[PDB]
Amino acid sequence: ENQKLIANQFNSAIGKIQDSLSSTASALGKLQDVVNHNAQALNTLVKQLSSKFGAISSVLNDIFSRLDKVE
């Protein structure tokens, strides 16, 4: 009878730990997805930022050139 109690409590504990491991796996999956997406976001942000800053620099260089031609 004590063995049946031990077995029942152990099976309940293993079921609960199974649920906990499934929850931890799901949570780590969602964190992985979001951290990866934000990583790609920051990366493409700095890429498009480099492009835009270079374009700004170009059009500046242009307007210095043209204003020098004004003088």
Binding site: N2, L5, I6, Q9, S12, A13, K16, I17, D19, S20, S23, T24, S26, A27, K30, L31, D33, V34, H37, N38, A41, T44, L45, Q48, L49, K52, A55, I56, V59
Partner: protein, 42 residues
């Protein structure tokens, strides 16, 4: 003359996701509290 309106364009096409794992965290805490009912009392 008449220099064209050079528009830089809007920075776009990007966005950051948002984690919502509070269900999972609450489930872990619920299980950590529930394992007290799984203790063995001979």
């Amino acid at each position: 003359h008449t220099s064209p309106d050079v528009d830089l364009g809007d920075i776009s096409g990007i966005n950051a996701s948002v984690v919502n794992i509070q269900k999972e965290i609450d489930r872990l805490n619920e299980v950590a509290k529930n394992l007290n009912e799984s203790l063995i009392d001979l």
